[PDB]
Design a binder for this molecule. Structure first.
Ligand SMILES: CC1=CC(=O)CC(C)(C)[C@@]1(O)/C=C/C(C)=C\C(=O)O
Length: 154
């Protein structure tokens, strides 16, 4: 019926720097490398906000409509739920959380992202769910790059 997983990333960057971009429900293309454009009306960063995401050409999907479910600026948790679009993900929801970790007298961030999604009557737990891991891992990878790049500038 459903299928779920958690992806993890060690980032060589301070938490607030990482959170300052993860917390922009309105500008996910800062780091999500498959998004081309994001539009959000009303109160931009507030539980209930809605983004219309445009995806770069040559993707299986072209459009996605997502809703901000959790935003914890004090605990560093952003939770979202995908509600419409071209893709085959149904009842997708994910939560990305951030945690302080010092590895080598080097202060950094640990990003943890869990999702739950429905699996089409057609496909399998593996088929549908591996696709999303790979995607999220791509996103987290890019979050580490973008994040570590800014660090090197400041
Ligand atoms: C890149 C892309 C391709 C799809 O086929 C589904 C969808 C359009 C939702 C997606 O944005 C998937 C986004 C995912 C899985 C996590 C996220 O975005 O944080």
């Amino acid at each position: 019926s459903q299928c779920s997983s958690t992806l993890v990333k060690h980032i060589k960057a301070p938490l607030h720097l990482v959170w300052s971009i993860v917390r922009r429900f309105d500008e996910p293309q800062k780091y999500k490398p498959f998004i081309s454009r994001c539009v959000v009306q009303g109160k931009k960063l507030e539980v209930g906000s809605v983004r219309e995401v445009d995806l770069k050409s040559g993707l299986p999907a072209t459009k996605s409509t997502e809703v901000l479910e959790i935003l914890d600026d004090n605990e560093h948790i952003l939770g979202i739920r995908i509600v419409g679009g071209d893709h085959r993900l149904k009842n997708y929801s994910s939560t990305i959380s951030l945690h302080s970790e010092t590895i080598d007298g080097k202060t950094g961030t640990l990003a943890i992202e869990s999702f739950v999604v429905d699996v089409p009557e057609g496909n399998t737990k593996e088929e549908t769910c591996f696709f999303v891991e790979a995607l999220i891992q791509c996103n987290l990878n890019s979050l580490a790059d973008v994040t570590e790049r800014l660090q090197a500038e400041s």
